[PDB]
Every structure is written in structure tokens, then in C-alpha cells.
Amino acid sequence: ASGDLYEVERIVDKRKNKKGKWEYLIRWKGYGSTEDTWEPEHHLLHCEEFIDEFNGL
């Protein structure tokens, strides 16, 4: 079974997995740095605005 869906505040960092796909270090809304977790990109639901903000212009 999946972990629960939690609300995202922002993306803190990113890295490639062994298969060449992004993982994102997530700042969870209502939490701080202590609670950040690395999540594969396929865990993200409609989070393109957070990815685009992180990557910048």
C-alpha cells in the first residue's frame, strides 16, 4: 500500500535515480526541514508548478 497523500509546500532539491528519473526532496506543507522526504517523481499529483518553480527560468 502507498503512503498517504500529503500537501506539498515546495521542492527543496532533486536528484536522478539509477534509472535516470527525477526524485524530489519535498518540503511538506505545515512541516519543516526535519520532515523533508525524497520522493520519486511518480509520487507527485499535478505538482508541475512546484517542479517549474524549483527549476526556474
Binding site: 502507498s2 498517504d4 497523500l5 500529503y6 506539498v8 520522493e39 509520487h43 499529483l45
Partner: peptide, 5 residues
């Protein structure tokens, strides 16, 4: 939202 593992 995202799945938190």
C-alpha cells in the same frame, strides 16, 4: 499533493 513514503 504527493505520496509520502
Amino acid at each position: 499533493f504527493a505520496l509520502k513514503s
